[PDB]
Each structure stands twice: as structure tokens, then as C-alpha cells.
Design a protein around this ligand. Structure first.
Ligand SMILES: [Ba+2]
Ligand SMILES: [Ba+2]
Ligand SMILES: [Mn+2]
Ligand SMILES: [Mn+2]
Ligand SMILES: [Mn+2]
Ligand SMILES: [Mn+2]
Ligand SMILES: [Mn+2]
Ligand SMILES: [Mn+2]
Lengths: 435, 435
């Protein structure tokens, strides 16, 4: 396995990071709890299992509750692997990552008693279940200096992590091309989603987030969760925000399409595409991410002017803050183990927070090598926001006829995942030839 | 009758049940909380929303959190319908007219819409702390819970109609899944074919479907989906259902690939046993009586196929049947998959004790009209249970060579959903022509 080579360096890095923080916080070690299955109210059914990000940060075990990692950075990390024995289900770790842990099998969740350290006074519990931690004897639960430290360095992806994210993007792109074909065949939102799921070989709960699969006016809906079962009478626009998972690492890709490939909306999409590519290539070590977000508002304003959506020059559109009506979210975010990855705001290991008139900007941190970003500029026609704009004194400056013409197409978003290197950029998505 | 007509009676029934219990428990009214969405640990993603069964018992609103129902049985039930306004993104169907609807635009503003004096109002929901912080004191009082759960077993005509539709959808799925199997598709592909035909998302189904090929058919709670079709195609077991207005279907079918051979004959024999067991459903009979007969029929099957060298009675007497048939014959089904009240003897909550020999059976309540059951006899070749059998002195009575021949096929389960009427039975599943 070519992943195994990189995974050895991955463990050594996590061990190194663990050594530092437990010595800085005077701890014996850190305990990572994979998590638990949540039971539905008054029912014997369970919610789908979601693994603790801090747990899967160590190893690709993401579908197994009641697992525990005990690490101090010097000894080999101890893996308490849950493996029940009853005829109701079907199951020993055999993959390359197993050899880097001291594995002890747990046949029953409550038996974790005797496998955890006896003196837990200086062992930090990192997990969601504080009452379970209390029942075990842990009193140090999710201490902020430890949380902030790990979250800070999570931004710096190891070579193993980059490999996993490249693979995640490979899978996602395959899905996006299948979803694209389904759209031009005139399928419904539901049918398009199904085509995506089949092509990625992902179940719905495997994706890093509930995919957004939108047609026509629904393209304006940022968090569009529902899928229409019936195809629209006329096909105008298509927006799919969908990703994939590989070993716990996420991909997050958006593409917008015009059905006919010509007309005002098709040109608008093409314009946003060139803006999106230009914004991607502005990523560089030393740059604050906030500068890119600002440049995006500049480009959205320019776009509004050129297509005569707003009857003003680009800079007055910026100054009046009209751009926020059409582009109300952030340009992008860190991505990795979590979709919206941690540490996006922090300036140091101690958790120095850097804030963004742009409340929904998710990244303000200085860009460095081995960090991974999304770049997702957008231009939408949302009724609530357009109504607010009409209530302002900027009413007279808006081409409402133009807005009416473009409204049935919903909106535009184009998203890529980019690895920043020392002297180059790696746009994983477009290098996989997703136009 | 159409759903609109039937629903009028449904409300009148719930109103009546409510009047009786608040008078009995000296309450002013009962409050049903739909629930909330659960946020994932250290993340901004949420678990898929699962509605409170007690809430959706009143109306088909199953995807909307922060909803509240205030009822006393005499006045119209008040519905606090959550309808927020954000650019991230009103009831008008037949059921809307039966509620006094008050729109909630933000979840923390609910306090002004709830009763001023909440002392004698019973809170029925999962979020106790939320309720206590609102003023509620009575948290899911057991006499109220028991009362509702007991009468939940008696389905209104509206509820029966919903379940008929749920079964109609599921049957379409099973037919598509069956065809995919004979085409030699993988478990994953079969599941996706099922979802497409039912127009269900993975989280829309009442449970995670069990889609099993060959040896996997022996695993009762088989959750995984193999992405690669087995080199040899021998058997197929799909346990899958559907949802309609919050009401569930629960159907299992088992297939032999070639349609000939010992396993195919075993499937056909189990099918005739299953049909006969369905027809044993009758008002006045304890459900345990049917469970006992199932063990007798499984024993007779084992004997006839010479898997066990004993008569049926001997197989029963030595407790050998439980090796091949380890679970219950079935359960009540409705708003919940394993519906409530199936173990009750009265509305007070007293337990109807299971028949001797099966203390773990939890569907024991005396059968009555307008109740809905599953009938799912099974015969499996499970390694864990067969190992235990080999360790006992009954080892001598087992044709282990035949067991080894049948083991690669996994096991058999056949499940239908049946409505019990006054002097007739309605097998919703087989009425939709699913062999
Ligand atoms: Ba010490
Ligand atoms: Ba009274
Ligand atoms: Mn120490
Ligand atoms: Mn996205
Ligand atoms: Mn994103
Ligand atoms: Mn009547
Ligand atoms: Mn079933
Ligand atoms: Mn069942």
C-alpha cells in the first residue's frame, strides 16, 4: 500500500504533537473517545453513527462506536477496539494502520472499565459523552488548551491526509460527472442525487454533508436539502453541491450548469467560472484569506455591472454594499477531517481568534503550505434579500426587469478544493478535469 | 374513503383519548413536542431529524423540529408550526383545518405561545431541560404514556389507509430489488435500486434496510452494503420497508438464485408456513400462541429436510429450534417499526407475560381488531449458534454435513404486514402481488 508509507509519518506527527501538548499541560496522556450511537426517543432505533473527529484523526475507523485511543506521544497509541460477539451482526483489524497501535478488543461497552488507566487524574478525556467520562473517573474533559492546540495543527495536513483528500475528490468528481449527465437527460432532483450516489458508491450517510441538488429556482436556495421527485416542465439551470469521503476526509465540490449552453444565464455562469479560477490562483502562503473574500465581492460587483443587473459601476456597488444581496455567504473554508474544518479563525496555538461586515466568512487565518481550502464564489437571486434591497434607497439603482429575467434560473456557485504548497497550488478538482 | 374523510375521525379519536386521560390524571392538557435537530460533536453538521412519535401521532408533520401541540380534547388542538425566515431556507393540506395554527418564526419565541400556567400540563417530549426551562414540571408522566401507548395498538381507519400506502410503496421497492438480484448486482446496487423505486432517501425508510447476499443472509441485523457482487450467486434476503405520513411498512423476502435445489425447496416450505401463520391471526388469541406454532413448524421443517434427525416434537422438547429460529415471530407495527403497546395487558401498563420457553418475546398482547402485525418466521444457519449446539449433547442429532451444504445460502426470512379485522384478515403485502 502506498498509503501505508505516508501513514507511518502521519502517526509520528500525531505522536509528536501529543508529546508537546501533554508536557505543556502537565498531563499523563490523552484519551480519544470515538463516540456512541444515539437512540431515538421512545424507540429502539438509532441515529446513524457519527465518529468523533478527534478520534478518526488518528486512524480510518469511522463506523465503530465505543472505541478508545489512549496516547501520550512516547509509547505506541493504545487502541481499544469495540468488537461485540452476538449472532445479531457480523465482524479483527487487519489493515496497514493496525500495526501502529496496541490493540485490545472490547466485547462489551461497559467493560472499558479495566482497559483504561487506573489513575485518570491527569488524563484528558476528549469526547462528547461527559457523563460516561465521569462514570469512568475522568475529571479533565475537553480542556480548551488541548482542543485549541490540536485544532490549530489540524490545518497543517500530513502527506497521508493530502493523499486521502485527493482520493475523496477523485470519487466526488466521478459523481459530479454522472449528475451532470443526468441533468442534461432531464432527470428530477431526486433522480440526479441517486445517479450521484451510485457513481460514488456512497450511501447518503457516507457523504460529508447532505448533498444540495437543485434545479431552476431552487438553485437560489443555499441549503437546499429536499429533492423534487418530479422533473420540472422546462429545464433551465442546475446546481449541485456534493462531496465524498475517503478514510474520514471530505471533499466539497459545487458546479452550476445552463441547460441550453447559451443565453444570458449561460454567459453569467461562464463569467463566474473565470472569477472562481482567478480567485483560486490567488491562494498563497503569507496571504490572509480575508483578502481573497474581499476580491470576490469586487468581482461580483463587476459582474453585476457588466450584465447590467445593477445600473452602477463596480466600485459604487461595492461601496453601497449591494454585493451582499447577491453574494451573502463566505468565499470558503478549511476542509479536511470535517467539512468546515477546525482552526479556520485561530492565529496561534493558544486560540487567538481573528474575526471577519462579513459575518459568514469562515476563514480569516493566514494561509500556509499544506493547508487545504475551498473556493466557492456565488451569485444568487433570493427573494428575501432582493426584497430587503428594494426596501433600501438602493432601489432606484437595480435593474429589476433584469432580476426578473434571471430569477427563474436561481443562482450560481462554483466550488473547488485546493491544496496550497510552498511554491505551487494544487486544485484537486480541476486537475481531475471537472470543467 | 379518501384520507381527508378518514382523518376527521382520526382527530375525533385522539381528542376522545385525550379527554379521558387528562380527566383521569387531573390534567389541564397535554403538550406534544416534535423535537429538535441534534448537532454533531465539534461540528456544525446535524444528525438527520427524527420526529417524536407522540407528535406525529396527530398529523403528518415529520420533518419539522420546534413544533408543539397543545391539546385537552375538547377545544381544537393548537399547533405551533415552526416556519423560520432565512435566505438559507405554510400548512394548506386537509389536516391543517383541524388545528388552530400559530406560526413560530424562531424556536426561542415559543414561550409566548404556550399556556401561561403549565403546572397541570403534561410535557411529552425528549428535551426535558428545554421543557423545564419553559416552566413544565410533569416530564412524560408514565400513566399518560401508558394510556396513549396502549390505545396506539388500535389503529384508526386513517392510520390503516396510511399503512396500506406505505406497503404499496415498499412492495414496488422489493420488486425492483428482486430484479436487481437476478441480474447479479451487488448489495449496494440492490439497495440503490430499492431507493429509486420507492422514491425514498436512505433516512426516509423506517429503518436501515437489510440487503444481504449468500452467507450474509444469516446475519439478522446486517447493516453493511457490499460494493462488489459475489463471484457466486446463491441467495438473496432483503428486509426493507417504507414510510407514508409517518407510518411504516416492514417487509422481508428471501430468494434462491436458480430456483431449484434444497435451499429453494426450503424457501418454498417456509413460505407456506409463513402464509399459514398469517392466517392464524385472530381476535382473542394471545400472540404468543402463534409464536409457539412457528417453533413447531420450524421444528417440522428441520425434521422433514433431515437437518435434524428427530421428530418435530422432540426438536421442540430439546430446545433445538432456537438455534435456527432465534428471534420473535413478529411485532405490532404503525407509527413506529416495533410499535408500542405490544407487551401490555391493560392501559395501566401491566405486562402480558410471554409463553414459557420464550421469556424474551415482547409481542404478547391479546390480538384484537384494527391491530396491525408483522409475521416474520425465519430459519437461519448462524455460525455462532451452530457452534453452541455442537458443544451440547444434542450434537448427535444434527446432520452437520447438510448444515455445511446449506450454510453458504445463509438463511431465510419471510415477512408480511397484516391488519386484523373483525372476521377477516388483510395481508397488505401479498395483496400487492409480492410472492
Ligand atoms: Ba503521573
Ligand atoms: Ba378534575
Ligand atoms: Mn507523566
Ligand atoms: Mn459545498
Ligand atoms: Mn463548502
Ligand atoms: Mn363511523
Ligand atoms: Mn423486517
Ligand atoms: Mn419486523
Amino acid at each position: 500500500n502506498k498509503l501505508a508509507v505516508l501513514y507511518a509519518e502521519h502517526i509520528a506527527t500525531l505522536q509528536k504533537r501529543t508529546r508537546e501538548i501533554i508536557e505543556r499541560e502537565n498531563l499523563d496522556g490523552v484519551v480519544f473517545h470515538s463516540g456512541q450511537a444515539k437512540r431515538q426517543f421512545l424507540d429502539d432505533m438509532y441515529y446513524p453513527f457519527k465518529v468523533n473527529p478527534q478520534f478518526k484523526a488518528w486512524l480510518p475507523v469511522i463506523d465503530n462506536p465505543h472505541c478508545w485511543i489512549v496516547a501520550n506521544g512516547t509509547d505506541k497509541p493504545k487502541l481499544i477496539f469495540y468488537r461485540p460477539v452476538d449472532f445479531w451482526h457480523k465482524v479483527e483489524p487487519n489493515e496497514y494502520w493496525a500495526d501502529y497501535f496496541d490493540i485490545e478488543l472490547l466485547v462489551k461497552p461497559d467493560q472499558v472499565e479495566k482497559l483504561l488507566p487506573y489513575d485518570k487524574a491527569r488524563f484528558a478525556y476528549i469526547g462528547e459523552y461527559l457523563e460516561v467520562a465521569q462514570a469512568l473517573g475522568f475529571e479533565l474533559m475537553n480542556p480548551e488548551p488541548v482542543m485549541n492546540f490540536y485544532h490549530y495543527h489540524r490545518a497543517y495536513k500530513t502527506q497521508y491526509e493530502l493523499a486521502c483528500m485527493r482520493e475523496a475528490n477523485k470519487i466526488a468528481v466521478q459523481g459530479h460527472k454522472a449528475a451532470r449527465d443526468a441533468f442534461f437527460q432531464g432527470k428530477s432532483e431526486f433522480e440526479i442525487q441517486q445517479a450521484y450516489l451510485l457513481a460514488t458508491q456512497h450511501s447518503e450517510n457516507d457523504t460529508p454533508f447532505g448533498n444540495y441538488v437543485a434545479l431552476n429556482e431552487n438553485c437560489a436556495i443555499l441549503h437546499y436539502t429536499h429533492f423534487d421527485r418530479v422533473a420540472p416542465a422546462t429545464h433551465r439551470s442546475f446546481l449541485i453541491d456534493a462531496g465524498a469521503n475517503f478514510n474520514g476526509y471530505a471533499a466539497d465540490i459545487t458546479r452550476t450548469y445552463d441547460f441550453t449552453g447559451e443565453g444570458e444565464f449561460a454567459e453569467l455562469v461562464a463569467t463566474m467560472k473565470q472569477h472562481q479560477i482567478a480567485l483560486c490562483n490567488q491562494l498563497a502562503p503569507g496571504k490572509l484569506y480575508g483578502e481573497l473574500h474581499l476580491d470576490c465581492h469586487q468581482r461580483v460587483a463587476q459582474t453585476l455591472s457588466d450584465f447590467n443587473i445593477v445600473n452602477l459601476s463596480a466600485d459604487e456597488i461595492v461601496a453601497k454594499g449591494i454585493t451582499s444581496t447577491f453574494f451573502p455567504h463566505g468565499l470558503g473554508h478549511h476542509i479536511g477531517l470535517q467539512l468546515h474544518d477546525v482552526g479556520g479563525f485561530m492565529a496561534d496555538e493558544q486560540g487567538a481568534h481573528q474575526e471577519p461586515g462579513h459575518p459568514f466568512l469562515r476563514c480569516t487565518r493566514k494561509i500556509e503550505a499544506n493547508q487545504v481550502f475551498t473556493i466557492e464564489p456565488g451569485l444568487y437571486f433570493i427573494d428575501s434579500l432582493l426584497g430587503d434591497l428594494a426596501a433600501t434607497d438602493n432601489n432606484q439603482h437595480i435593474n429589476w426587469d433584469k432580476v426578473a429575467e434571471l430569477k427563474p434560473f436561481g443562482g450560481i456557485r462554483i466550488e473547488d478544493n485546493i491544496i496550497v504548497h510552498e511554491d505551487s497550488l494544487e486544485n484537486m478538482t480541476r486537475e481531475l478535469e471537472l470543467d
